Amino acid sequence: KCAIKKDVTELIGNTPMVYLNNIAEGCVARIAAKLEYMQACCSVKDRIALSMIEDAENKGLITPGKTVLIEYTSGNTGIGLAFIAALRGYKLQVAMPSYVSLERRIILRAFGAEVYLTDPDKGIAGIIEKAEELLAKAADGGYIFKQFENPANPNIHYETTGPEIWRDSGEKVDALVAGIGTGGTIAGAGKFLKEKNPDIKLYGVEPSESAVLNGGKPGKHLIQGLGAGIIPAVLDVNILEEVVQISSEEAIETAKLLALKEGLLMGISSGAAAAAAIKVGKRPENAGKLIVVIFPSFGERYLSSPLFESIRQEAEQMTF
Amino acid sequence: KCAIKKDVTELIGNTPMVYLNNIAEGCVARIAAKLEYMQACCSVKDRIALSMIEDAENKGLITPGKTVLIEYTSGNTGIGLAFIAALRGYKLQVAMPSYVSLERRIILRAFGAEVYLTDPDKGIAGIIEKAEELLAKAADGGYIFKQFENPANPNIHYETTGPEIWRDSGEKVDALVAGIGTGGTIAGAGKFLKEKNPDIKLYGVEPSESAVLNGGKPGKHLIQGLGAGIIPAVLDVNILEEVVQISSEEAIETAKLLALKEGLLMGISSGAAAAAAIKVGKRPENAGKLIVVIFPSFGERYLSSPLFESIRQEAEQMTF
Ligand SMILES: [Cl-]
Ligand SMILES: [Cl-]
Ligand code: NA
Ligand code: NA
């Protein structure tokens, strides 16, 4: 009884950290990775799905069996909303670009969510437009979560992710490295950490092919979860020390090294974040410091992605 | 520093339990599920991969960069060995039936393991034969782990899984329900629990189409992870109260209900174990008792399985 969780929502957050060892050869800082796949549905977005649903409930803006929940998503936020909507009795509709993997669409449908695909050429505008169309058709009321502007997104990282890093690092964390998608993680956890110790430095990560935070133009890239092509409303770029640019190729190669050297089967965005943390960790000014890097998800969620393309081809041609 | 794990092997075990709620409507016992996907590579077998490797190391039977590690597996034990072999510098070869999913073969190759497929018509005999062939070809020595007879398999569940259940249940657990594959989980955890409280009852689960523990003949079934068609050497059937028989169909339907009612995307063998626990939990003699049920893995590992067949067909036919 005494440690048994009430339901799946009590399995969100409280994720562990692990040192990076052989992959960090040459670093003069120590690097610890926070493993966001170790929770209810195996990604960081589980935190914001619960936070945004609870916020809407506290305001009476969603009611089970009445309100249609709606979100625009590339997959992980939709999945986070979907398992909680199933548990709590909400109808859920997600708008997603048609390039999202079949695997993530299967997971959404297994939780009973409805999937509406959009034209990839219309970008973020396309999925926001579809979410607005769905809201207009909701006969008994709907609610769009809007994770790029909803304060419950950074706020949950201020309330949980940041405090976990501070406590679990023994208050010794010197820097946070985090890829920026919505920017909620680095905005909320970083705000908390700098309140605890204003010397802590925050490093964003973005694709070098879509380096909008550094003033570049949007462009196509492979780092799923990063590079939305916009500066999200929930992110204040002024608190950042730097936004490190990582190529799709470098992110994929570093993800492969996480599996082969650390035994960690991680996704492309974790590869990008690790590559950035290792670069920062080689700088002489960081000698003896502790760098914490966010790993947002698990590699098993991305087996149809370019991360595994050449392996997939080999395994298809094998027999007994 | 103070809670940061040394490496991925310190992320094995110590998994949480969660109450089952709406899916257990009608039960007069309370049911708590132990979530073995919440660890390093998301299955119960991570425990025995580390235990069997450490045992061989303690005996000097495997040496990194010299010994070829070999195991016969249907996937999860191979994956557990593979991430530790990658971390520690061991070459690993696995023998598997050719029906194992492409997804699990991709994961094995991403960790650098070599995959040797066998004829499914030769059953367990086929994969043991291939492992013996590989051992004969190992020029500098090899080692076959033999999870069906290796005592390090049940012993780790005596040392970790059982103690976790006892402690996390506040010493109130009255019964353990666990599917039997190698039988290591129920043998080791059950042995520990009955030492703590000899009134605790142990319920195995097996497929009704391959009910060998109940005296039936082996047969084809869909409950991946259960129903090896043999009685493994590491299992003493005499400690069991009962082996509950669950059909492939019932296991799949219950797995679907775990996702839709509990928000838990679980695999077919977790569906079978939950179905058995819910049946036992409806018996009047168990009124007021606490039943713990083992959930061995996560449903995302099985998206190409019959559990998702009809959803997969729907999602393939969708456009923007
Ligand atoms: Cl293969
Ligand atoms: Cl779809
Ligand atoms: Na302060
Ligand atoms: Na005793």
Author numbering:
A (entry chain A), B (entry chain A): 4 to 323
Give verbatim excerpts from the published study on this entry:
The crystal structure of PvBSAS4;1 was solved in the P41212 space group, with one protein chain in the asymmetric unit. The biological assembly of PvBSAS4;1 is a homodimer, in which the 2 subunits are related by a crystallographic 2-fold axis, and cling to each other using their N- and C-termini. The positively charged active site of the present PvBSAS4;1 structure contains the PLP prosthetic group and a molecule of benzoic acid. PLP is stabilized by a covalent bond to Lys48, creating an internal aldimine. The benzoate (BEZ) molecule is located ∼3.7 Å away from the PLP ring, with its carboxylic end facing the protein core and the phenyl ring pointing toward the entrance to the active site. Its carboxylate interacts with the backbone amides of Ser77 (3.0 Å), Asn79 (3.1 Å), and Thr80 (2.9 Å), as well as with the side chains of Thr76 (2.5 Å), Thr80 (3.0 Å), and Gln150 (3.0 Å). The phenyl ring is stabilized by hydrophobic interactions with the backbone of Gly184 (3.8 Å), and side chains of Phe151 (3.7 Å) and Thr185 (3.9 Å), which create a ligand-binding cavity. The structure of PvBSAS4;1 includes a few more accidental ligands, attracted from the crystallization buffer, such as 2 molecules of glycerol, a sodium cation, and a chloride anion, all bound on the enzyme surface. Although we did not obtain the desired substrate complex of PvBSAS4;1, we found a distinct patch of electron density corresponding to benzoic acid, bound in the active site in a position usually occupied by the OAS substrate. Kinetic analysis indicated that benzoic acid acts as a competitive inhibitor of BSAS4;1 with respect to O-acetylserine.
